[PDB]
Design a protein around this nucleic acid. Sequence first.
RNA 1: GGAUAGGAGAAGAUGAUGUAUAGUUUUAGAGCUAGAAAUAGCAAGUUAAAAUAAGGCUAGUCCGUUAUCAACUUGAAAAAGUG
DNA 2: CAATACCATATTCATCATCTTCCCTATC
DNA 3: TATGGTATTG
Length: 1169
Amino acid sequence: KKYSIGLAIGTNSVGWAVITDEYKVPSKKFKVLGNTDRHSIKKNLIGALLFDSGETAEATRLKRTARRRYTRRKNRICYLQEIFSNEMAKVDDSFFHRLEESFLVEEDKKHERHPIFGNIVDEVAYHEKYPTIYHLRKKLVDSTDKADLRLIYLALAHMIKFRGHFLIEGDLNPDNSDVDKLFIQLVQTYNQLFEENPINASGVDAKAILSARLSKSRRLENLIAQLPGEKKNGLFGNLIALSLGLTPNFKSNFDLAEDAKLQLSKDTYDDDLDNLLAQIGDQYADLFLAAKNLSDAILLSDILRVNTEITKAPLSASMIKRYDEHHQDLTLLKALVRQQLPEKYKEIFFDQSKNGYAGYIDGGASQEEFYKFIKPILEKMDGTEELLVKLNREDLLRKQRTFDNGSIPHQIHLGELHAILRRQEDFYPFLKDNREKIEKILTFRIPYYVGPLARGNSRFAWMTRKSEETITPWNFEEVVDKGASAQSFIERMTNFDKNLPNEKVLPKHSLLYEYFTVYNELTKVKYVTEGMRKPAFLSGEQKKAIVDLLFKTNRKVTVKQLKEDYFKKIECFDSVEISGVEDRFNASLGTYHDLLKIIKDKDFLDNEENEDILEDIVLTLTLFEDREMIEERLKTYAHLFDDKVMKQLKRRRYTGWGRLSRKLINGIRDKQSGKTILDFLKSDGFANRNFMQLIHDDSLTFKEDIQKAQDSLHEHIANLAGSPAIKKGILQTVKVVDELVKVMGRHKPENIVIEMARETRQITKHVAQILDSRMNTKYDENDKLIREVKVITLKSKLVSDFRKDFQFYKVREINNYHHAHDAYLNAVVGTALIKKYPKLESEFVYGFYSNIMNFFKTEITGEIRKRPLIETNGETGEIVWDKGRDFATVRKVLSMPQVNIVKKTEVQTGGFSKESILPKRNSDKLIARKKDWDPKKYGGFDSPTVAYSVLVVAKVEKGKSKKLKSVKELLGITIMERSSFEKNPIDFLEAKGYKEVKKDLIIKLPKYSLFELENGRKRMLASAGELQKGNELALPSKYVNFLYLASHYESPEDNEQKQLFVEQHKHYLDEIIEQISEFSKRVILADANLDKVLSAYNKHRDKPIREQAENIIHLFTLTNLGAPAAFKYFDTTIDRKRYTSTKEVLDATLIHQSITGLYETRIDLSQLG
RNA sequence: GGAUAGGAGAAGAUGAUGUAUAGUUUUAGAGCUAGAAAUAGCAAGUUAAAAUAAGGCUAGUCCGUUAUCAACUUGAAAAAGUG
DNA sequence: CAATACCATATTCATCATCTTCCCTATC
DNA sequence: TATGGTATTG
Ligand SMILES: [K+]
Ligand SMILES: [K+]
Ligand SMILES: [K+]
Ligand SMILES: [K+]
Ligand SMILES: [K+]
Ligand SMILES: [K+]
Ligand SMILES: [K+]
Ligand SMILES: [K+]
Ligand SMILES: [Mg+2]
Ligand SMILES: [Mg+2]
């Protein structure tokens, strides 16, 4: 009994088939377990496993980090409150308690309902004096009077809780006082560098034009329009664009050779500026220098829309400006609406459902929706004027808590907080003593290279502590080892040397690694001349000279330079033929030239004794990104260089890691020669062996040491490189193969032909390697692997062309059988191919081409050369194909109605429910967001996810008498309930109200559990209260091919014959419909939908056959396995008819399917109760 | 064929960490005038606190949405055995 | 109870690391 | 997306 296995691997399906030598699919009897009358069942050995897609880890990680951020924000507020504690207690012993319970209803409140002061009069007074928190912030920044401690806390808390971003490094110190003067000074520098061509900047209001609350490009265009003879692409135009934050290119301004794009935000502005000035001249520096000065005064103009001189709180003042303009424009708009149209005042200022002002404030209308709503009403009326300008500038009726506040840096909030602390520390001593602590609460971040501040219970953490104590914002630098933590941050993700697995790879920019690459390329270079008979290899001295004269004087080395600067200047050759390198050498010594420019000491870089130093330096520049840590680490070598050299080293960083370790490049040495790999690359006599040759040479001891230096299925698949969905498909494929092998009496197949859905692809090679290493586990006498099973991989186009050439067409919309059919055809074609041309094994088996598939055909074209009926192997003489019976066998297999389509049952995981926080409602569907927040008072969640249902057989109390009535029903265990239910199912069910639960009759039913009812009708579990369609529609292959040909009506005469087949078999349409109808009336039970379908088909029966076939393909949605879905027949829409009740499957037959569906356990549920 | 090291640009796949802004929910921000009331007229609106998976024990400024899952027997589990 | 329509958190920056493919050089 | 939860309307 010999057999082969065909596999079609997809992201949502694994199709499988078993074929024999005659390319037939066997049919067996399988035992049926359970309690029904059926003891066995006939099964064809072909099918497909269907499953929901595997998900990436992204959403989980995002929610994880959001959780962390909420926790740490709460801890910031707790730090600030603990600082204020005792003095607040002396002022108001329940202030923080009122803040904590602000969310509670007055019934549940333990203190007075007014948070700040505890009485209504003072609260109304506060809100009247300070209508927004920014009024209080500005007052506390600017006033010299002692303030109530509660307002001080509220201001500091608003700043710390919403502290702004950390994208800008250093300090800011805002100052918009002299934008005009800095612009005039930039014009002065320009006119001094170009005395013949000045710029007349008189009458140019640069202040209003560069802080015009418009795009950087718009303000640039406007400032250039005020300058005749000057264009935006000119030198001054590009300088202005640089001051505005754009990225101008100063190449054409200075007639440069290459680009010189400058941006003040990049970390490389100093380097780019110094390079441009080295190209053009340092006397232009005061130009860009001036451009930076002005830039500072503009660096924050979009956020601080107020003068910095009248207040030390520019941001709160800009918010107050927003508020005042909102108030004034609202009064104006109210008056204008009242006057113009008395109607629509209700719609605009009272209807929360509309995107008017009511929906903008009270409803769910965003600023953009409200703008779209009011723009036509504003244009219709008159007197609007500046309102439309504010609207198109997006500065009309603005709130203070908006989406664009993401622009606000944390330095601005820090400035206002520092000002408030400076003001109020004169009256409160604890504020003076804890000023820096509070500023630190605002400023402190956890470094990205530190990670969670865990203590041995986080699989995500790598941080190391210098001392065992709680980490606070104030002791972080003393308790946390920032250096070791950053090193762990990088190293825990970098690869070890695959040759020496206990060795880390070098930095990609290591000087040693670059020497290795340069010498590995140079050692295989050959040069020929006239007097030479054959190409000779470069000797050690020649390679050293080329490295010293070309690679250590030019970053890149060209073949022209190799021939003219060495072979002519040194060897006195006028013509030389080079081989091994095209145009230019790929390897180079970039790190060498970088360090040579930085330190300006060639003898330092050429001295081999300075090797281990430089390496570490490069390592430090690769290991670390934080410039402070780089400075601290490089301080050890500050005795070798100057202060300027050390600063240039600080500003130099690298990223990237090589693939080989230092102990492999320069470390291990051959036993008899004492030379390392780099030593052989520098000089190997006349052999000039490169890296692979050296580590593959049996006459050397490198291969021996590499050999001396040298998991579970789920682990191994999880560690592969690929999308998680395809990894799911791979694991399911392996499990299907294990089951199929077990079905064949533990006998292994001859061939496994795999095809991966969309072969040199690496993931298909991984599948093939896993299968090959699992099937072939024995060795022969020569200690070589015995390949009992040939693992062939085929690309989808082979079987696709096979189908389209022999008319075995697929229609994916008809059912899911096409996956199993693909697996079968893969098995057939792969086995036939390797039986016909065995020499192709090295190409297809793990471990002329345009006509490779022609042996299947009988007539082949312009050849028109015939072929025999019986195709055999040339040498073995074995029959591989009988065109008189094997095509009929394939056609018979593709027509079998019984195919094992199995939907993988899966417990649902993930979020508990929909995330929307719903308002309070009188419904038991609402879920409390906190233990004590009764959703009838506070709202909450609805729509939870059912992890799996449970069949319960028990009694429930009925009526006021609480009479016990026997029940049997499906209970949905939600994801949030799951741990509680599994910890104690009886107590969970009793708390749900169930009494006398038959614990042994409890059946766990995950999603997609299968039930059979009458007439073979099947249903799958979608939830505890909804079902999906469970039957496949096995349509005859004649209708399949007819639909294929009628749909894609649009080139041999066979196209004309296919059109003739379509026109002769138009009646098939009706038959198809009839088939569907029967299927429906047997398994779908969608009366109204089936009637709408019949009527729509009768209406468009006069349509072209092509469109009718396409719309019947659409109609197949009604019968498809799985969840119901709406579809469209011509212009008629058929909505999904759902199965909103799971009551019938309580008396049906539950079917537990194995992975292939061949092994079944059938439980008659009507017997329970 | 497969594999390895390197190079130019691109085009994708994946994993982790540290941040920010909103949104939503309840409460607070005295609504007024006629009306018994139903209701009508007007005034007003921009802000804040708190929660942001219920929660957990390991109690950390940590963890809580990925992967993995037919039934039966054995298993903590992974997984193995049953036709 | 069934037919039916509505609903579903979003956007944003910074630092890394790993893998793949395409085309070249040199190899096992 | 799409498909399972929910309220609405009979
Ligand atoms: K109370
Ligand atoms: K101009
Ligand atoms: K709104
Ligand atoms: K808000
Ligand atoms: K090259
Ligand atoms: K770095
Ligand atoms: K899952
Ligand atoms: K199953
Ligand atoms: Mg929490
Ligand atoms: Mg908010």
